[PDB]
Amino acid sequence: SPFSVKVGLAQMLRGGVIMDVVNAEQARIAEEAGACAVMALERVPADIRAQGGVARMSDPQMIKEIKQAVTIPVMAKARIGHFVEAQILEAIGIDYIDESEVLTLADEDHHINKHNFRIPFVCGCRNLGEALRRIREGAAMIRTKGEAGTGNIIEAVRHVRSVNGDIRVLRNMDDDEVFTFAKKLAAPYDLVMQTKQLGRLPVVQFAAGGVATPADAALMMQLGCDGVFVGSGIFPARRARAIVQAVTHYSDPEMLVEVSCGLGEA
Amino acid sequence: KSPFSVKVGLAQMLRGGVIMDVVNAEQARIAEEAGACAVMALERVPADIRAQGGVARMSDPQMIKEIKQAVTIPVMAKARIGHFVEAQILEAIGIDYIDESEVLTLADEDHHINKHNFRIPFVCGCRNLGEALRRIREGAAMIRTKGEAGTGNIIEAVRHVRSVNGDIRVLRNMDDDEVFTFAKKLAAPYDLVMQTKQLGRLPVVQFAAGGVATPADAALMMQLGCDGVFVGSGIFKSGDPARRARAIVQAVTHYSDPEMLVEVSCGLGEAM
Amino acid sequence: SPFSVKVGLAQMLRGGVIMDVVNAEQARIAEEAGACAVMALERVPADIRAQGGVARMSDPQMIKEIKQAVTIPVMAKARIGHFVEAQILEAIGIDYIDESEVLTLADEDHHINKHNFRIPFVCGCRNLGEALRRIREGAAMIRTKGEAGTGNIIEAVRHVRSVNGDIRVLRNMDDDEVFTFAKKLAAPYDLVMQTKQLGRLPVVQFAAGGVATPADAALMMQLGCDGVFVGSGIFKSGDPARRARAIVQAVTHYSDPEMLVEVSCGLGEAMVGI
Amino acid sequence: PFSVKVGLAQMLRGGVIMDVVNAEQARIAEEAGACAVMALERVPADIRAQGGVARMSDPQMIKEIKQAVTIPVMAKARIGHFVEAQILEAIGIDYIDESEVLTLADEDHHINKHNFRIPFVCGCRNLGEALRRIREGAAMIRTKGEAGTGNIIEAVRHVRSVNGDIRVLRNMDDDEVFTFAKKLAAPYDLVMQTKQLGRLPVVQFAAGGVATPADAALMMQLGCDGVFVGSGIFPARRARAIVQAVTHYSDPEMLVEVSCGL
Amino acid sequence: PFSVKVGLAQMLRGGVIMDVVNAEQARIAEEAGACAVMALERVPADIRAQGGVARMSDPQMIKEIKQAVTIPVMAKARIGHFVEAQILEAIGIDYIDESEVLTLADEDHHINKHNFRIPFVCGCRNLGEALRRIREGAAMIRTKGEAGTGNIIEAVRHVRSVNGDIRVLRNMDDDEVFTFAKKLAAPYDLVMQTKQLGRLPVVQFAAGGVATPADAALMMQLGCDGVFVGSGIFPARRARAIVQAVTHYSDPEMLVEVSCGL
Numbered sequence A: 001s002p003f004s005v006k007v008g009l010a011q012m013l014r015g016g017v018i019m020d021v022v023n024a025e026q027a028r029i030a031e032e033a034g035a036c037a038v039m040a041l042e043r044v045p046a047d048i049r050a051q052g053g054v055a056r057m058s059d060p061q062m063i064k065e066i067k068q069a070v071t072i073p074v075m076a077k078a079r080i081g082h083f084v085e086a087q088i089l090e091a092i093g094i095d096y097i098d099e100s101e102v103l104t105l106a107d108e109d110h111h112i113n114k115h116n117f118r119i120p121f122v123c124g125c126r127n128l129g130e131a132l133r134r135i136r137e138g139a140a141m142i143r144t145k146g147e148a149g150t151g152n153i154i155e156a157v158r159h160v161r162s163v164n165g166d167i168r169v170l171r172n173m174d175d176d177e178v179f180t181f182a183k184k185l186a187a188p189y190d191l192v193m194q195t196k197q198l199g200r201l202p203v204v205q206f207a208a209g210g211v212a213t214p215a216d217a218a219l220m221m222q223l224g225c226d227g228v229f230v231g232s233g234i235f236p237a238r239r240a241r242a243i244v245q246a247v248t249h250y251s252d253p254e255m256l257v258e259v260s261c262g263l264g265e266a
Numbered sequence B: 001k002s003p004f005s006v007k008v009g010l011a012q013m014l015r016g017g018v019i020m021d022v023v024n025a026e027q028a029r030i031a032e033e034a035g036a037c038a039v040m041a042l043e044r045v046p047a048d049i050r051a052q053g054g055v056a057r058m059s060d061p062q063m064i065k066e067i068k069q070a071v072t073i074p075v076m077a078k079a080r081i082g083h084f085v086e087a088q089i090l091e092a093i094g095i096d097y098i099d100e101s102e103v104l105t106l107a108d109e110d111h112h113i114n115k116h117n118f119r120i121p122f123v124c125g126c127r128n129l130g131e132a133l134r135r136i137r138e139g140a141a142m143i144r145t146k147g148e149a150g151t152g153n154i155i156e157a158v159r160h161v162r163s164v165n166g167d168i169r170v171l172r173n174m175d176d177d178e179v180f181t182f183a184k185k186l187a188a189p190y191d192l193v194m195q196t197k198q199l200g201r202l203p204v205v206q207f208a209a210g211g212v213a214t215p216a217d218a219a220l221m222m223q224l225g226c227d228g229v230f231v232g233s234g235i236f237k238s239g240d241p242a243r244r245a246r247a248i249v250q251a252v253t254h255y256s257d258p259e260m261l262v263e264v265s266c267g268l269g270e271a272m
Numbered sequence C: 001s002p003f004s005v006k007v008g009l010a011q012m013l014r015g016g017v018i019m020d021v022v023n024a025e026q027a028r029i030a031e032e033a034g035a036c037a038v039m040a041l042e043r044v045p046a047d048i049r050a051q052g053g054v055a056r057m058s059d060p061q062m063i064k065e066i067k068q069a070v071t072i073p074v075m076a077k078a079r080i081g082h083f084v085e086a087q088i089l090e091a092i093g094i095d096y097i098d099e100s101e102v103l104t105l106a107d108e109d110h111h112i113n114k115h116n117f118r119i120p121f122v123c124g125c126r127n128l129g130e131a132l133r134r135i136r137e138g139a140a141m142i143r144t145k146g147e148a149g150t151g152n153i154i155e156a157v158r159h160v161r162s163v164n165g166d167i168r169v170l171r172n173m174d175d176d177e178v179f180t181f182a183k184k185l186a187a188p189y190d191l192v193m194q195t196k197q198l199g200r201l202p203v204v205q206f207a208a209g210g211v212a213t214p215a216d217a218a219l220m221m222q223l224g225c226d227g228v229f230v231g232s233g234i235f236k237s238g239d240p241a242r243r244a245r246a247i248v249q250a251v252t253h254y255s256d257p258e259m260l261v262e263v264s265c266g267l268g269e270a271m272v273g274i
Numbered sequence D, E: 001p002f003s004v005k006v007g008l009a010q011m012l013r014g015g016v017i018m019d020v021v022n023a024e025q026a027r028i029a030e031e032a033g034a035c036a037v038m039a040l041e042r043v044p045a046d047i048r049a050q051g052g053v054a055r056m057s058d059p060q061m062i063k064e065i066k067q068a069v070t071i072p073v074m075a076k077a078r079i080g081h082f083v084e085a086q087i088l089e090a091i092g093i094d095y096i097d098e099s100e101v102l103t104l105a106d107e108d109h110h111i112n113k114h115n116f117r118i119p120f121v122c123g124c125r126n127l128g129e130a131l132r133r134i135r136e137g138a139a140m141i142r143t144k145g146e147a148g149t150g151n152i153i154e155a156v157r158h159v160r161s162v163n164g165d166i167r168v169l170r171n172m173d174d175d176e177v178f179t180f181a182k183k184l185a186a187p188y189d190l191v192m193q194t195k196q197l198g199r200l201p202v203v204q205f206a207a208g209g210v211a212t213p214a215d216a217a218l219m220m221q222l223g224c225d226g227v228f229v230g231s232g233i234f235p236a237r238r239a240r241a242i243v244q245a246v247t248h249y250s251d252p253e254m255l256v257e258v259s260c261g262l
C-alpha cells in the first residue's frame, strides 16, 4: 500500500537526528556532523517565538538551495491545514513535509489530508489520541512535542511519557475495554488495535522541542523515541556532532561524558 | 463474505417490519398473527419497568423458550448493557437476536458487550450517530434509534431519528478533508463514518423504538426514514392489543397511504 | 511468616461461593448447596439497608449455633475499626472475620489492626489503593464491593474492572513510574511492586454486592474474580435452596454457557432489588 | 435591477481585487492583471497600526485612481453610512464596498443597498450574515478573515463555515429548512434560493490575510470565486504572482514558479 | 547496597556543604573546613536573578573542581533527568543532588536512584516528600528553604514540619500509623522505620537561605545533621565562620566570636 511505503521511508531515519537549517552552510554542517536529515526553514523556533509575526512556508528558492547543498533527505514545514503550501513543497522535490505547530496555524479545525500526497508527512502530537488522528490523516511519522524554542525538555518528557505510557496501558488492556478507550482517545479504533498489537506507535516517533544538550537527546532515546529533532539547540558544528553521537550511543555513559565535556554554552 | 456482514444481512430481512414486546406464548401468537416480523421476549414491558422500579434483568430462559416454541417468526430477547454472560446464556438458548437494551438496568456503565464474540446478531440502541457507529463497531448488526420507552410519547424518538438521519445527510456532501474532524467530534471510528458517507444511510438496519403509540406514530417513523419500528407498551397496555397490533403493522407496511392510515385508526380504541 | 500462612489458608476458597446466613437451617442449606463457607449474621444487607438502625456484630450465641451446624468454614462480620468485636469473634472460634462496610462504621478514620489477630480477615475494597491498604493492615482476603442489598451488579462490575484494570496497567508500567503510582494510590510501595510482579492481587479476591443471578456470579468469575459472596440474592428470592445450588454451579462452570442455561432455567423469582 | 447588479459582479469571477493608494499603484495593479482596484487612503494594516477614525476617502483621490485605469474601481464606505455611499456613487465608480475595516458608522443597521444604482460588496463571517447582506442588496460578498494581519486562519475558518453550511443546506430535509432559516436569522426565501443553487446567490470572494500566492490558491481550492488583497502586495511581481495563483490555482508547478524567490 | 550509601552519607554529619564555581572556590571551601563541595556553574541566587533554563554543569568544570580538593564533590542534576545522573556518575563524583533549583526535567517522576552506584541527595519540604525520595533511593535528604533569597523562614518552617511529624509519629498509636502513612502518601514500611528510629532514616541537612552563622547554628539546634550553603558565602572568613557555627552550635560565645565584624 502507498501508506505502508511512506511509513517504510520514515523508518530509515530511526536512530537519527534531524536538524533545522537556514542556509546551505548550516545544511553542510548538519550533514558533516551526521544528521539523518535537515529541516529547511527561514527562521528557527527560538526566533519565531521571540519575533512574533506570521510564520509560513519558506521560499522555494531557499529550500532548493538546501536540497542541492546536501545528500541526506530534506524536510520543510507547512502550516497546519495549509494543503496548498504542501502542494508547493511536494512540487519542489523535497523528501518530507512537516505539518508543523511552530508555524502559524492556517486551519484551526482541520489538518492537511495527507493521503492526497505522494511524499511522506511528519506531524506533531502531545498524546496518543492526537498521534493516531494524525496517522489516520496520513502522517508517516510523528513528532512528540515539547516546547519548541525554550531549550526546556520538561514538556517533551511529559508528552513522550504520556504517549508511551498509553501504549503500555493498551498492551494488556481487556479487549472488551478497547472500544471505550478509543472513544476516550477520540482515535480510530483500528489504529488503536494496531498499536495494541504492535506494542508501539505504528509509525516512527521522534521527540521534538527543547532538546538542548547531549543528555537531553540521550534521555529521549532512553524513554523510547526513535530519534530527535533539534532546531535552536545547535546553531555549533561541534554541538551538532555531540547530539548525533548522544543519539547513536544513548546507553553509553562514557560516550555521553566525552561528547558533553567542554561542549560550551547551550 | 464476512461473519459481521452475514449478521447484518440477517437483520436486513426485518426491513419494513414491526417488532413487538411479548410476555407469554399467547401474546406471542397475537403478535405473529397480526403480522409482526419478530417478537421481543421479556418479563416486564418498558411501561411496567418504568413505573414499578426494581432491577430489570434478562428473562428466565424457560419463559423465552416457551415464546420461541409458540411462533415461527424470529424471537429476540434483552440483555443488560455490558452483561456479556446474560448474552452468552441467551445465545445458548438458541434465539435469533440479542437486544443489548437500555430499558433493563445497566450492568456496566463504561463498556458494552463485545458483540463480535457472538455468532448471533445483536440489536443496540442509540440517540445520535456517534453512539450508533460505536455500537456497530462493537458488533451490533442492527440499531434502535431510541425515544422515551414506556411513555407513549413520540417526541424523543422524533428528536433522535432526526438527529441520526440529519447527521448522515450532513456527511453526504461533506468535504472529504473535514471528515477526520467530524469523526473525532462524533467519537466514532473514521472507517465507519466514511462507510456511512458512501452509503448515504446507516451501515445497518435502523428501527425506531420508544413511545410509538398509534398507527400515525408508526407511519411517522417510517416517513422520517426508519426501516421498521419496535413497539412494546403501545399495544398490550392499550384497550384492544390484537386490533392495535394489526393496525400498527399495517401502518408500517402502508406508511405513505393516508387512506390506509385512516382505516386502521378509525375506531381503534384507547391508546396506552 | 504468620501473615503468609493466613493468605495461604484462604486459597482454599478459590472457586467458591460464600453465603450470608441467619440461622442454622439456612447454614445447612448453604452447605448442602455446595457453599465453600457461610457468613453468619443477624440481618442480611438488603434488610440492613431497608430497616435502618445500628448494625453490629451478631450475638455470639447465634454464631455458635451456625458454627456447630456446618462443617465448612464460618465467617462473621465486625464493624470497621471495632477491634473488640473482632477479639470476641476470635474467642468464639470462627474461621474468618469480615471487617465489613455493611455494618455501621465504628471508626471512620482507622481500620482494625488485623496483624494483632491469629485468625484471617476479609476486608472490602472499591479500588486497588483501598485493597492494598487493607492488605497492609493485615487482611488475608479482599472483597471487591458493589452495592450491598440492591441486587444490582453495576457497582461490582465497576469496582472489579477498576481493581483489575489498575493491576493490568501496573504490570506493564515503566519501573521508574511505580513510585508515583504508589503515591497516587496512597498505597504501600512494597505491595504495589508485589502486585506488579504477580500480575494479580497478592491475596484471594472475591466479588461481593449485588450478585442476584447465576449470570451475575459467572460474570464476576469471567471478569477475573476468585469467587463471590452472596447475601440477599439467595434467601430474599423465591426458591433459595435451588437458587443457592444454581449460583454455586455457575461459579464452578462459569465458562460453560450450556450449564449456565441449565441452572438458570425455571429458577423462579430473583430478589426484588432496588 | 438586482439581478443586473448580481450579473455584473459575476464578471469578477476568477479575479484579484487589489487595494491601491494612488494612480501609480492602480496602474501596477492593472498591469499585473487585477480584475479591479479598491481605492483608499489607508491600507488595512496601516488602519490597524495608526488607529483613529477611518472613513470614505477624499473624492479627489478616488477620481484620480478612476482616471488612471480602465478596470473597475471600487471604494469603501463606512457601514451604515448611506451618505458616503451617495457621494461615491455620484463620483461614478463601479462598486461600493460597505466595509468593516472602516470605523463602523451605524452599529445596528447596514446601508439599504437597494436604493443605489451601482453594485455593493459586503462582508460576512457566516452564511446568515451573507444572506442578510444580500437581502439588503449586496451584489457581492466578501467572506472575511482578519484584515491587515497577513494571517489566513480566520479567512479559512469563515470560508469553511459559509461553504460547509451551504453543503449542509443542499441536502437538508425541506421540512427542516424553516428552522434552519430561523437559526441563521436569515430570510427563508434566500435560504431556499441558496439550497436550490447549491452555492451562494452572489459572487463570493475571500478577503483578509491573503499574503502569499499559496494563500490565494488555497482560497480558490476552498471554493471562493476570487480574492481581495490589500496589505499583502505594496511589488509588481508579488501582484502578478497572486493573479497567477488565482488563475492557475490547481497547478502546483505554476504555484512554485510564481512563489520562487518572491 | 542502599544501607552502604546511607552509611557513607552519615560521614557528612556535622558538616557544611558549600556550593562552588571553580577550583579556587573549592579550595577555599575545603580550607575553611567544609565537609564537601557542590560544584555548579550558577549559584542559586544567580539562577533566580538571571532566569533561563538551568541544567547539569559542564563535565569539564566538574572534573576540575574534583581534581582540586580531596573532600567529596557533589554535583546537581535536574529532577527526573536520569541521563544527567548517568553522566555525573561516569565523571566519578561522590554524590548526585537531584535538585529543585535546576529547571525541572520531569514534573511527575524523580530519578529511580536505586539504579545508581553513588549516593544521591534529594530535597523535601515535609516528611511525606522525604520518605518518598528515600524510597526512590536517596541516601540523604535536604530539608529545603527558599534557595537564593538569604531568608531562613521557609527552612525553619520545613525543618519544624519534618521533625514535628517525626515526633508525632514516635508515640502515635500503632493502629493509627496505617492511616498516617496514607495521609502522608508515604510507604508504610518507611513510616514504621522512621517511627522506630525516632528520626529520619537518612542524614537530614538544611538548605536554602542559610546566610549567617546564627542561621546555621539555628538549623543545628532545630535538629538538622548539617547545612548546605550556596549564595551565602561567595569570603574565606564567612565560610570558616559558618563551619565553626555548625561545629559549635550550642556555644553562644563561639557564635559571637565568628559573627563579630563579619
Ligand SMILES: */C=C\C(=O)[C@H](C*)N[C@H](O)[C@H](O)COP(=O)(O)O
Pocket (backbone or CB within 6 Å): A018, A020, A039, A044, A045, A046, A077, A098, A100, A101, A102, A103, A124, A143, A145, A146, A147, A148, A149, A150, A151, A208, A209, A210, A211, A229, A230, A231, A232, A233
Ligand atoms: C514542535 C516542534 C516543531 O513543530 C518543529 C517543526 N520542529 C523543529 O524543527 C525543531 O526541531 C524543534 O524545536 P527546538 O528549537 O529544537 O526546540
Ligand SMILES: */C=C\C(=O)[C@H](C*)N[C@H](O)[C@H](O)COP(=O)(O)O
Pocket (backbone or CB within 6 Å): B019, B021, B040, B045, B046, B047, B078, B099, B101, B102, B103, B125, B144, B146, B147, B148, B149, B150, B151, B152, B209, B210, B211, B212, B230, B231, B232, B233, B234
Ligand atoms: C428504547 C427501547 C428499548 O431499549 C427496548 C429494548 N425496546 C422495547 O422492546 C420497546 O419496543 C420500546 O418501548 P415502548 O414501550 O414501545 O415505549
Ligand SMILES: */C=C\C(=O)[C@H](C*)N[C@H](O)[C@H](O)COP(=O)(O)O
Pocket (backbone or CB within 6 Å): C018, C020, C039, C044, C045, C046, C077, C098, C100, C101, C102, C103, C124, C143, C145, C146, C147, C148, C149, C150, C151, C208, C209, C210, C211, C229, C230, C231, C232, C233
Ligand atoms: C459489601 C459487602 C459486605 O460488606 C458484606 C459483608 N458481604 C455480604 O455478606 C454479602 O455477601 C453481599 O451483599 P449482597 O446482599 O449479596 O448484595
Ligand SMILES: */C=C\C(=O)[C@H](C*)N[C@H](O)[C@H](O)COP(=O)(O)O
Pocket (backbone or CB within 6 Å): D017, D019, D038, D043, D044, D045, D076, D097, D099, D100, D101, D102, D123, D142, D144, D145, D146, D147, D148, D149, D150, D207, D208, D209, D210, D228, D229, D230, D231, D232
Ligand atoms: C475585511 C476586509 C475589508 O473590509 C476590506 C474592504 N478588504 C480590503 O480591501 C483588503 O482586500 C483585505 O485586507 P488585507 O490587507 O488583505 O488583510
Ligand SMILES: */C=C\C(=O)[C@H](C*)N[C@H](O)[C@H](O)COP(=O)(O)O
Pocket (backbone or CB within 6 Å): E017, E019, E038, E043, E044, E045, E076, E097, E099, E100, E101, E102, E123, E142, E144, E145, E146, E147, E148, E149, E150, E207, E208, E209, E210, E228, E229, E230, E231, E232
Ligand atoms: C534547595 C536547595 C537546592 O536544591 C540546592 C541544590 N542547594 C544549594 O546547593 C544551596 O546550598 C542552597 O541555596 P542557598 O543559596 O544557600 O539559598
Ligand SMILES: O=P(O)(O)OC[C@H]1O[C@@H](O)[C@H](O)[C@@H]1O
Pocket (backbone or CB within 6 Å): A080, A101, A105, A107, A108, A109, A130, A133, A134, B184
Ligand atoms: O485535536 P486535534 O484536532 O486532533 O489536533 C489538535 C492540534 O491541531 C492543531 O490545531 C494544534 O496543533 C492542536 O494542538
Ligand SMILES: O=P(O)(O)OC[C@H]1O[C@@H](O)[C@H](O)[C@@H]1O
Pocket (backbone or CB within 6 Å): A180, A183, B081, B102, B106, B108, B109, B110, B130, B131, B134, B135
Ligand atoms: O457513550 P457510549 O459509551 O457510546 O454509550 C453511552 C450509552 O451506553 C449506556 O451506558 C447508556 O445507554 C448510554 O446512553
Ligand SMILES: O=P(O)(O)OC[C@H]1O[C@@H](O)[C@H](O)[C@@H]1O
Pocket (backbone or CB within 6 Å): C080, C101, C107, C108, C109, C129, C130, C133, C134, E179, E182
Ligand atoms: O483506605 P481508606 O481510605 O482509609 O478506607 C476507606 C474505606 O474505609 C471506610 O471508612 C469506608 O468503608 C471507606 O470506603
Ligand SMILES: O=P(O)(O)OC[C@H]1O[C@@H](O)[C@H](O)[C@@H]1O
Pocket (backbone or CB within 6 Å): D079, D100, D104, D106, D107, D108, D128, D129, D132, D133
Ligand atoms: O447581520 P448583522 O448581525 O446585523 O451584522 C453583523 C456585522 O455588522 C457590522 O456591525 C459588523 O461588521 C458586524 O460583524
Ligand SMILES: O=P(O)(O)OC[C@H]1O[C@@H](O)[C@H](O)[C@@H]1O
Pocket (backbone or CB within 6 Å): C180, C183, E079, E100, E104, E106, E107, E108, E128, E129, E132, E133
Ligand atoms: O513527592 P512528590 O510530590 O512526587 O514530589 C514533589 C516535588 O517534586 C518535584 O517535582 C518538585 O520539587 C516538587 O516539590
